[PDB]
């Protein structure tokens, strides 16, 4: 079929509403309400004037279509199946110049709807920028390439927007919904078998990005004279916490019958703050490809889920972001009504008060050395005194208890022993229903909210809303028997583990109920997996860990603790940077700086790992597990990423005698305490070894110190901004007055002929894109790898890389002048995992110090390949270089500034002079190397690194990608986090140079983009 779109681009006010009336209870943390919606003398209130897209009937944009209440501001739903022809007939009716680029689907340079340097002329940069009147017809194509993966639902969610600017043009509310199903997946454009269809956004829709904020102040600031558009208040004024453009309980429409099949297509879009946690509250949308029960969305995430609307009432849609929760990022929904489970399983807990002390040894495991000496990591989060409460907390916890009669606990075994501070393992089978007595014991009110199971709104833990204590509310004595269910509909899939790990937690006010220590393991498992004491049955060992940043200054019981701890309360500011530093208590099931025990098993046991996480937009974790390597999913990685309410089911079987870490690969939350140690013991004696490793390899790679340049050449950002008609200003590269410019000494890893280590090996053409990284070492499955390393630097380095196993647990690091040798093995479970694609990569990095080492330059791949035009591969590494934490920075300073004397190195302008956002060590599309053929296959070896702040959705413009085991998957947006190390394969198609850039905010202005040529066969 070939569809005809008109789409004309208005300009207007959008009401972000207020419903002007209540019946909305969204109290959930709510009340603050009057910043964001306030009208006055500065704030704007909820009115600003936005463009957006709007669907007209003929080619004379006059008559108009009309979107779906729930729809929001977005553009017109634009659906095409697999082969058709869509043209997009746009028309600009506004007061400057917009575009429309489609994200998946094929389109030639003058279809792409985007602006900068690709080399092209006039015939194929109409599209590429619309001015305000002009007209343009867009034709894309539904190929085959883009089409779902085999493995991907009918239809999967693509989105599309404009591209001067596509930040500003996105805030300025210039985005919609494009909808790609396969073959016929569609009958009267609405999927076959599908009775509701809906499109969510989740986004920080955040308005001092949009063109019309001027526009917005001049008119709605009643004093429009005095607003300082610098000022922090006034911006936060301005973001929108909102799903469809809504936000305080707004979005109107969602509604479904009972037995409804409702399928959801998400994606999130915003900046860096932007870290989602969508929550359907009343069920199980439960069919990505699996059972989910919370979906995390970030900058330009597409996601797509299916439901089966049941248990009939007034639900509702939030994002467990606590920080985008209390902001009001909420939603009703409703399922209008239009056999159990006898095993009960009965647990008696009552909320009681401690004080959790968060390392009891008092000392960093890790380094030996005092928690409190004077200026260190710990330090901060541990010196006690006048203004600082330092160590232990009075926190408030859940325990269990033997039975109504709450006077007595259970023993915690030692196989408890690890649980920490959280609260006791609820579980359960598939058929079963659970009845905790809760029995509150604090000086305030509280209840226990379940995720993962099915109740009904007796039950429901949390109170929105459109002395006897209730299943929302136990008063500080009252007592109560939530009674839940675990029907099919809401245990594992098929495809799903025997067991998933699940939570609980309490939520009579979630943004603080939490870190005061409410929050407790649970596990629901396939009918018939455990025995009688809750264990699986093939499994030695199951352990659960909560990897979070415990906000001490957020905790319901946090006067008292400034009471009790310091030595000087009255005089404790409150709202002091550096008070809530020192209680920002990051931690792992409540210990840091390796206190915490109980992780020991036997090596060869079957271990399987629980992870779960909560928290704000800081909790952007990647659990390492040093040594060995787990089974996520089908596919084999080291390193498990979490965030706001995510939940993991790790399997892992160590192989490896010793004892190593357990750690938060990010680095805030490493320095902070985020690190823990798991032993492994042999508990066998096991065989003679003279029988397998079929291969050997052996590489001579040294660290160099070498003077390395961000950005050599500026001409493509220079011309990218004139395209954009921007007069901007860079941060990061403007040597201005003494700051340093985009040139820094750094150490890296570059590869050697042999052992003598004075003839390098010359990058040849296909390794030019490498920039920073180090040589892409190849090793199979089965090889004896080994490193001859040389350190040719100034200081103690190291080399060391995830997935790859080694004798020891130690890594002994090389001095300089110093060449040692490093063996790493590369067995089956190094390798591709039953589901991964035959090569996988891991990074390899230094381990003497794993932040300054790192942010100094020392980073590459190591590709490991399973089995025995051209096939190509490319390394790509998305990370925000910290030069701040280069071990170099002094020299730097004396070397590049042109005033050193003058750099005051605290200067939060200074700080952020040197955060370098590149790819593989390069900004604004100085990235060269990057070449293909039309016909090529091409592998991508994506892997990130750093900071809480490395989100990285990376876009492909003009060309998807395929994913797991045989290109199953199909998308052009994938997501990227400290740890991630991710395969792509990907055809190029349509020839010509196209962008390549991380889709968040802050990112794309920084320079993390570069462009990738697809040349004609
Ligand atoms: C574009 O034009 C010139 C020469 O072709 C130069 O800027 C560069 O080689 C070209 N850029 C790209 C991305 O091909
Ligand atoms: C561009 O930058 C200059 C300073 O370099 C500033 O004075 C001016 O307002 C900006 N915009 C224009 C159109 O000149
Ligand atoms: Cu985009
Ligand atoms: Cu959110
Ligand atoms: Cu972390
Ligand atoms: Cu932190
Ligand atoms: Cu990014
Ligand atoms: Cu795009
Ligand atoms: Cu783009
Ligand atoms: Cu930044
Ligand atoms: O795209
Ligand atoms: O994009």
């Known amino acids: ?290 059972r989910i029960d919370t979906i995390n969305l970030f900058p330009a995430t597409l996601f797509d889920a299916y439901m089966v609307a049941q248990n009939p009432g007034e639900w509702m849609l939030s994002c467990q972001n606590l920080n985008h929760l209390k902001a009001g990022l909420q939603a009703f929904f409703q399922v209008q009504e239009c056999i159990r489970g006898k095993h009960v399983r009965h647990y008696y807990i009552a909320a009681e008060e401690i004080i959790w002390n968060y390392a009891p040894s008092g000392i960093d495991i890790f380094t030996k050395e005092n928690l409190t000496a004077p200026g260190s990591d710990s330090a901060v989060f541990f010196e006690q005194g006048t203004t600082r409460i330092g160590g232990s907390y009075k926190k408030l916890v859940y325990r269990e208890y033997t039975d109504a009669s709450f006077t007595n606990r259970k023993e915690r075994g030692p196989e408890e022993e690890h649980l920490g501070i959280l609260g006791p393992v609820i579980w359960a089978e598939v058929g079963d229903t659970i009845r905790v007595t809760f029995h509150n014991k604090g000086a305030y009110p509280l209840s226990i909210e379940p995720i993962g199971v099915r109740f009904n709104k007796n039950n429901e833990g949390t109170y929105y809303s459109p002395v006897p204590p209730s299943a929302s509310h136990v008063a500080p004595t009252e007592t109560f028997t939530y009674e839940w269910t675990v029907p099919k509909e809401v245990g594992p899939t098929n495809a799903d583990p025997v067991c998933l790990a699940k939570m609980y937690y309490s939520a009579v006010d979630p943004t603080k109920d939490i870190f005061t220590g409410l929050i407790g393991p649970m596990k629901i498992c396939k009918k018939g997996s455990l025995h009688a004491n809750g264990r699986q049955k093939d499994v030695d060992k199951e352990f659960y860990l909560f990897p979070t940043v415990f906000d001490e200054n957020e905790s319901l019981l946090l006067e008292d603790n400034i009471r009790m701890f310091t030595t000087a309360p009255d005089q404790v500011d409150k709202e002091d940077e550096d008070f809530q530093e020192s209680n920002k208590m990051h931690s792992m099931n409540g210990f840091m700086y390796g206190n ?237 995992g039953t589901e991964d694609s035959a090569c996988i990569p891991w990074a390899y990095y230094s381990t003497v110090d794993q932040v300054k080492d790192l942010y100094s330059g020392l980073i590459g791949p190591l590709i490991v390949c399973r089995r025995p035009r051209r096939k190509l591969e490319f390394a790509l590494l998305f990370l925000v270089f910290d030069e701040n934490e280069s071990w170099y920075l002094d020299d730097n300073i004396k070397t590049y500034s042109d005033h050193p004397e003058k750099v005051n190195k605290d200067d939060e302008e200074f700080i952020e002079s040197n955060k370098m956002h590149a790819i593989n060590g390069r900004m604004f599309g100085n990235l060269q190397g990057l070449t293909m053929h039309v016909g090529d296959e091409v592998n991508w070896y994506l892997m990130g690194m750093g900071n809480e702040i490395d989100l990285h959705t990376v876009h492909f413009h003009g060309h998807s990608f395929q994913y797991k085991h045989r290109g199953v998957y199909s998308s052009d947006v994938f997501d990227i986090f400290p740890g991630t190390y991710q395969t792509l394969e990907m055809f190029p198609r349509t020839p010509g140079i196209w962008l390549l850039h991380c889709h968040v905010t802050d990112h794309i202005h920084a320079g993390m983009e570069t462009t990738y040529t697809v040349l004609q066969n």
Request: proline residues 4%.
């Open 1 to 290: 079929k070939e569809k005809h779109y008109y789409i004309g681009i208005i300009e207007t006010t959008w009401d972000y509403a207020s419903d002007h009336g209540e019946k909305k209870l969204i109290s959930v943390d709510t009340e603050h309400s009057n910043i964001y919606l306030q009208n006055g003398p500065d704030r704007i209130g909820r009115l600003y004037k936005k463009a957006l897209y709007l669907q007209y009937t003929d080619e004379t944009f006059r008559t108009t279509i009309e979107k779906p209440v729930w729809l929001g501001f977005l553009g017109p739903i634009i659906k095409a199946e697999t082969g058709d022809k869509v043209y997009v007939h746009l028309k600009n009716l506004a007061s400057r110049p917009y575009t429309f680029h489609s994200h998946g689907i094929t389109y030639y340079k003058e279809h792409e709807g985007a602006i900068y340097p690709d080399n092209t002329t006039d015939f194929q940069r109409a599209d590429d920028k619309v001015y305000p009147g002009e007209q343009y017809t867009y034709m894309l194509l539904a190929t085959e390439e883009q089409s779902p993966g085999e493995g991907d639902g009918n239809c999967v969610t693509r989105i599309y927007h404009s591209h001067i600017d596509a930040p500003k043009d996105i805030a300025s509310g210039l985005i919609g919904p494009l909808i790609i199903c396969k073959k016929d997946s569609l009958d009267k454009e609405k999927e076959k078998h599908i009775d509701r269809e809906f499109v969510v956004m989740f986004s920080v829709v955040d308005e001092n990005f949009s063109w019309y904020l001027e526009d917005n102040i001049k008119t709605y600031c009643s004093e429009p004279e005095k607003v300082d558009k610098d000022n922090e208040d006034f911006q936060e004024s301005n973001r929108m916490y909102s799903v469809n453009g809504y936000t305080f309980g707004s979005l109107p429409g969602l509604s479904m019958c009972a037995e409804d099949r409702v399928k959801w297509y998400l994606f999130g879009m915003g900046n860096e703050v932007d870290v989602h946690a969508a929550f359907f509250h009343g069920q199980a949308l439960t069919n990505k490809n699996y």
């Open 596 to 832: 915490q025990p109980g992780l020991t098993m036997c090596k060869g046991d079957s271990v399987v790992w629980y992870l779960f996480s909560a928290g704000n937009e800081a909790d952007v974790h990647g659990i390492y597990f040093s040594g060995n390597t787990y089974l996520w999913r089908g596919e084999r990685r080291d390193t498990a990423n979490l965030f706001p309410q995510t939940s993991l089911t790790l399997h892992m079987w160590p192989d490896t005698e010793g004892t190593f870490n357990v750690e938060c690969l990010t680095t805030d939350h490493y320095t902070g305490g985020m690190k823990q140690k798991y032993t492994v013991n042999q508990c066998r004696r096991q065989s003679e070894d003279s029988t397998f490793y079929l291969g050997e390899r052996t590489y001579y790679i040294a660290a160099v110190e070498v003077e390395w340049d961000y950005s050599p050449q500026r001409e493509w950002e220079k011309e990218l901004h004139h395209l954009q008609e921007q007069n901007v200003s860079n941060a990061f590269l403007d040597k201005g007055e003494f700051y340093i410019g985009s040139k820094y000494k750094k150490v890296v890893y570059r590869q050697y002929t042999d052992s003598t280590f004075r003839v390098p090996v010359e990058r040849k053409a296909e390794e030019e894109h490498l920039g920073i990284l180090g040589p892409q070492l190849h090793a199979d499955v089965g090889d004896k790898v080994k490193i001859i390393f040389k350190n040719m630097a100034t200081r103690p380095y190291s080399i060391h890389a995830h997935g790859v196993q080694t004798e020891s647990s130690t890594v002994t690091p090389t001095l300089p002048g110093e060449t040692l040798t490093y063996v790493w093995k590369i067995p089956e479970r190094s390798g591709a």
